[PDB]
């Protein structure tokens, strides 16, 4: 498991206006919880918390 920002299709965040939009999207996806990052390393996005390893995260790279 990491702390991360999940990824969508390909290596790109989902952007969020909402915490509950991020903690939805994190916790059906095998999260504890999520919420909107809006200042991060790869700014406006999603973090999840306790994401587990088969779920995709935003690496270093571009969002293709």
Request: aromatic share 10%; charged share 20%.
């Amino acid at each position: 498991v990491r702390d991360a920002y999940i990824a969508a299709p390909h290596n790109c965040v989902y952007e969020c206006a909402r915490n509950e939009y991020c903690n939805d999207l994190c916790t059906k996806n095998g999260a504890k919880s999520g919420y909107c990052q809006w200042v991060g390393k790869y700014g406006n996005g999603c973090w999840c918390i306790e994401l587990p390893d088969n779920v995709p995260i935003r690496v270093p790279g571009k969002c293709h």
